[PDB]
Write a protein that holds these residues in place. Structure first.
Motif, PDB file in Angstrom:
ATOM      1  N   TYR A   1      59.440  73.403   8.043  1.00  0.00           N
ATOM      2  CA  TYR A   1      58.384  74.328   7.673  1.00  0.00           C
ATOM      3  C   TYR A   1      58.967  75.635   8.220  1.00  0.00           C
ATOM      4  O   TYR A   1      59.339  75.488   9.523  1.00  0.00           O
ATOM      5  CB  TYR A   1      57.127  74.081   8.045  1.00  0.00           C
ATOM      6  CG  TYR A   1      56.175  73.155   7.501  1.00  0.00           C
ATOM      7  CD1 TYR A   1      56.363  72.941   6.030  1.00  0.00           C
ATOM      8  CD2 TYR A   1      56.255  71.881   8.045  1.00  0.00           C
ATOM      9  CE1 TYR A   1      55.756  72.021   5.148  1.00  0.00           C
ATOM     10  CE2 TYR A   1      55.447  70.620   7.296  1.00  0.00           C
ATOM     11  CZ  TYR A   1      55.482  70.702   5.855  1.00  0.00           C
ATOM     12  OH  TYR A   1      55.209  69.594   4.970  1.00  0.00           O
TER      13      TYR A   1
ATOM     14  N   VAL B   1      48.654  73.932  18.246  1.00  0.00           N
ATOM     15  CA  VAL B   1      48.179  73.314  16.938  1.00  0.00           C
ATOM     16  C   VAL B   1      48.082  71.752  16.839  1.00  0.00           C
ATOM     17  O   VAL B   1      48.978  71.003  17.355  1.00  0.00           O
ATOM     18  CB  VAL B   1      48.554  73.784  15.693  1.00  0.00           C
ATOM     19  CG1 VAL B   1      47.808  73.573  14.136  1.00  0.00           C
ATOM     20  CG2 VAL B   1      48.660  75.609  15.853  1.00  0.00           C
TER      21      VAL B   1
ATOM     22  N   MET C   1      56.737  79.243  11.486  1.00  0.00           N
ATOM     23  CA  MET C   1      55.660  78.405  11.857  1.00  0.00           C
ATOM     24  C   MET C   1      55.284  78.866  13.437  1.00  0.00           C
ATOM     25  O   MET C   1      53.901  78.981  13.895  1.00  0.00           O
ATOM     26  CB  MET C   1      55.839  76.761  11.687  1.00  0.00           C
ATOM     27  CG  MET C   1      55.796  76.558  10.368  1.00  0.00           C
ATOM     28  SD  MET C   1      53.920  76.535   9.584  1.00  0.00           S
ATOM     29  CE  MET C   1      53.458  75.110  10.387  1.00  0.00           C
ATOM     30  N   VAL C   2      56.440  78.883  13.970  1.00  0.00           N
ATOM     31  CA  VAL C   2      56.590  79.149  15.339  1.00  0.00           C
ATOM     32  C   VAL C   2      56.622  80.813  15.508  1.00  0.00           C
ATOM     33  O   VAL C   2      57.511  81.412  14.967  1.00  0.00           O
ATOM     34  CB  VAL C   2      57.313  78.603  16.265  1.00  0.00           C
ATOM     35  CG1 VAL C   2      57.126  78.844  17.840  1.00  0.00           C
ATOM     36  CG2 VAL C   2      57.506  77.223  15.836  1.00  0.00           C
ATOM     37  N   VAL C   3      56.258  81.585  16.608  1.00  0.00           N
ATOM     38  CA  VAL C   3      56.189  82.974  16.966  1.00  0.00           C
ATOM     39  C   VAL C   3      57.056  82.863  18.313  1.00  0.00           C
ATOM     40  O   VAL C   3      56.638  82.402  19.269  1.00  0.00           O
ATOM     41  CB  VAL C   3      55.109  83.707  17.264  1.00  0.00           C
ATOM     42  CG1 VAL C   3      54.933  84.414  18.191  1.00  0.00           C
ATOM     43  CG2 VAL C   3      54.252  84.390  16.009  1.00  0.00           C
TER      44      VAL C   3
ATOM     45  N   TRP D   1      45.802  67.564   8.928  1.00  0.00           N
ATOM     46  CA  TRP D   1      46.869  66.839   8.321  1.00  0.00           C
ATOM     47  C   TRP D   1      47.243  65.581   9.274  1.00  0.00           C
ATOM     48  O   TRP D   1      48.391  65.392   9.487  1.00  0.00           O
ATOM     49  CB  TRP D   1      48.171  67.822   8.639  1.00  0.00           C
ATOM     50  CG  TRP D   1      48.001  69.074   7.895  1.00  0.00           C
ATOM     51  CD1 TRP D   1      47.283  69.488   6.941  1.00  0.00           C
ATOM     52  CD2 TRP D   1      48.806  70.400   8.164  1.00  0.00           C
ATOM     53  NE1 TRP D   1      47.267  70.804   6.400  1.00  0.00           N
ATOM     54  CE2 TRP D   1      48.108  71.482   7.178  1.00  0.00           C
ATOM     55  CE3 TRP D   1      49.862  70.614   9.170  1.00  0.00           C
ATOM     56  CZ2 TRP D   1      48.896  72.671   7.512  1.00  0.00           C
ATOM     57  CZ3 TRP D   1      50.254  71.754   9.344  1.00  0.00           C
ATOM     58  CH2 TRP D   1      49.800  72.964   8.335  1.00  0.00           C
TER      59      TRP D   1
ATOM     60  N   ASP E   1      43.462  68.523  14.289  1.00  0.00           N
ATOM     61  CA  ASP E   1      42.585  69.774  13.854  1.00  0.00           C
ATOM     62  C   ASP E   1      42.712  70.152  12.447  1.00  0.00           C
ATOM     63  O   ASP E   1      41.647  70.884  12.142  1.00  0.00           O
ATOM     64  CB  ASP E   1      42.614  70.924  14.995  1.00  0.00           C
ATOM     65  CG  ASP E   1      42.834  70.632  16.398  1.00  0.00           C
ATOM     66  OD1 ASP E   1      42.412  69.520  16.821  1.00  0.00           O
ATOM     67  OD2 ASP E   1      43.312  71.428  17.117  1.00  0.00           O
ATOM     68  N   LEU E   2      43.930  70.304  11.956  1.00  0.00           N
ATOM     69  CA  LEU E   2      44.133  70.997  10.633  1.00  0.00           C
ATOM     70  C   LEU E   2      43.950  70.007   9.773  1.00  0.00           C
ATOM     71  O   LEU E   2      44.189  69.901   8.577  1.00  0.00           O
ATOM     72  CB  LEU E   2      45.565  71.395  10.563  1.00  0.00           C
ATOM     73  CG  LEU E   2      45.840  72.536  11.441  1.00  0.00           C
ATOM     74  CD1 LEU E   2      47.100  72.863  10.980  1.00  0.00           C
ATOM     75  CD2 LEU E   2      44.784  73.680  11.225  1.00  0.00           C
TER      76      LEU E   2
ATOM     77  N   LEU F   1      49.295  79.188  21.772  1.00  0.00           N
ATOM     78  CA  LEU F   1      48.551  78.634  20.854  1.00  0.00           C
ATOM     79  C   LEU F   1      49.233  77.104  20.576  1.00  0.00           C
ATOM     80  O   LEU F   1      50.191  77.358  20.095  1.00  0.00           O
ATOM     81  CB  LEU F   1      48.150  79.469  19.805  1.00  0.00           C
ATOM     82  CG  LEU F   1      47.150  78.922  18.696  1.00  0.00           C
ATOM     83  CD1 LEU F   1      45.737  78.584  19.386  1.00  0.00           C
ATOM     84  CD2 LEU F   1      47.206  79.551  17.485  1.00  0.00           C
TER      85      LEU F   1
ATOM     86  N   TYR G   1      51.976  71.427  17.502  1.00  0.00           N
ATOM     87  CA  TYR G   1      53.102  72.260  18.063  1.00  0.00           C
ATOM     88  C   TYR G   1      52.708  73.362  18.682  1.00  0.00           C
ATOM     89  O   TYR G   1      51.528  73.633  18.804  1.00  0.00           O
ATOM     90  CB  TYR G   1      54.227  72.351  16.997  1.00  0.00           C
ATOM     91  CG  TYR G   1      53.324  73.344  15.913  1.00  0.00           C
ATOM     92  CD1 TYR G   1      52.676  72.853  14.875  1.00  0.00           C
ATOM     93  CD2 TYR G   1      53.720  74.817  15.723  1.00  0.00           C
ATOM     94  CE1 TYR G   1      52.085  73.511  13.833  1.00  0.00           C
ATOM     95  CE2 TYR G   1      53.434  75.405  14.715  1.00  0.00           C
ATOM     96  CZ  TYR G   1      52.543  74.737  13.751  1.00  0.00           C
ATOM     97  OH  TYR G   1      51.866  75.725  12.845  1.00  0.00           O
TER      98      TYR G   1
ATOM     99  N   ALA H   1      52.463  77.161  18.451  1.00  0.00           N
ATOM    100  CA  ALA H   1      52.540  78.303  17.487  1.00  0.00           C
ATOM    101  C   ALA H   1      52.702  79.629  17.742  1.00  0.00           C
ATOM    102  O   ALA H   1      53.080  80.532  17.199  1.00  0.00           O
ATOM    103  CB  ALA H   1      51.347  78.024  16.484  1.00  0.00           C
ATOM    104  N   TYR H   2      52.129  79.701  18.948  1.00  0.00           N
ATOM    105  CA  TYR H   2      52.035  80.960  19.607  1.00  0.00           C
ATOM    106  C   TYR H   2      51.172  81.919  18.753  1.00  0.00           C
ATOM    107  O   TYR H   2      50.853  81.602  17.627  1.00  0.00           O
ATOM    108  CB  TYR H   2      53.457  81.348  20.040  1.00  0.00           C
ATOM    109  CG  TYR H   2      53.984  80.482  21.133  1.00  0.00           C
ATOM    110  CD1 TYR H   2      53.727  80.672  22.492  1.00  0.00           C
ATOM    111  CD2 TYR H   2      54.932  79.833  20.692  1.00  0.00           C
ATOM    112  CE1 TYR H   2      54.169  79.725  23.219  1.00  0.00           C
ATOM    113  CE2 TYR H   2      55.595  79.061  21.803  1.00  0.00           C
ATOM    114  CZ  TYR H   2      54.969  78.796  23.038  1.00  0.00           C
ATOM    115  OH  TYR H   2      55.870  78.090  24.173  1.00  0.00           O
ATOM    116  N   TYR H   3      50.902  82.909  19.471  1.00  0.00           N
ATOM    117  CA  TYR H   3      50.318  84.097  18.440  1.00  0.00           C
ATOM    118  C   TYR H   3      50.493  85.522  19.207  1.00  0.00           C
ATOM    119  O   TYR H   3      50.815  85.506  20.555  1.00  0.00           O
ATOM    120  CB  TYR H   3      48.865  83.835  18.380  1.00  0.00           C
ATOM    121  CG  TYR H   3      47.656  84.091  19.378  1.00  0.00           C
ATOM    122  CD1 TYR H   3      47.616  83.012  20.423  1.00  0.00           C
ATOM    123  CD2 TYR H   3      46.741  85.094  19.331  1.00  0.00           C
ATOM    124  CE1 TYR H   3      46.583  83.165  21.280  1.00  0.00           C
ATOM    125  CE2 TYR H   3      45.984  85.211  20.197  1.00  0.00           C
ATOM    126  CZ  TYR H   3      45.784  84.405  21.466  1.00  0.00           C
ATOM    127  OH  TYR H   3      45.095  84.595  22.137  1.00  0.00           O
TER     128      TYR H   3
END
Lengths: 104, 104
Positions: free
Chosen positions: A93, A10, A96-98, A17, A14-15, A8, A27, A29-31
């Protein structure tokens, strides 16, 4: 369908920001997704509670759900951005990453 | 339907461990269940990744699922049992009780 980490990405765009952040764009983020059920293989990181619960479940579905596939380790990220005042800053932050998923 | 910890009681009898364990009979294992979606209240413990992912989701369901409601802290237990040889022993099983759930 087993519990595993998936890709995943980001895009700060999109967000929304989109604006303040000099770098990066986005970045990894993975999930975590997948199922938590026997075989609860080891490289599927299950806690003890996970086994009991996976098991009770099997005895009595109505009773209880399988454990959920959640992230077991998180990594922070750093973005460089323009705060107010127009100072260029570096923020870290955290979480944030998985890095890894598993049955918990 | 929000993500929270729920009650669950394991009777060693159920699990078949009926025999070797002097004490206790069973225990409070608890289990995490509920939904992870906005409002991601604080006493619903969400990580950063959880928010992003909860959010991306909202933009693009197909893209990604809500985070899962998983246990955030585990507590060990001690059972006294008869090993072979007929020695009465004390074991600490770690990560048996759920203390707290949250969106991760």
């Amino acid at each position: 369908q087993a519990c595993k980490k998936h890709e995943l990405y980001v895009s700060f765009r999109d967000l929304g920001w989109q604006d303040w952040i000099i770098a990066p764009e986005g970045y990894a983020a993975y999930y975590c997704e997948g199922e938590c059920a026997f075989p609860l293989n080891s490289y599927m990181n299950a806690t003890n509670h996970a086994i009991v619960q996976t098991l009770v479940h099997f005895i009595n579905p109505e009773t209880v759900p399988k454990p959920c596939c959640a992230p077991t380790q998180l990594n922070a990220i750093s973005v460089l951005y323009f705060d107010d005042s127009s100072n260029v800053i570096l923020k870290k932050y955290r979480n944030m990453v998985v890095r890894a998923c598993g049955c918990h």
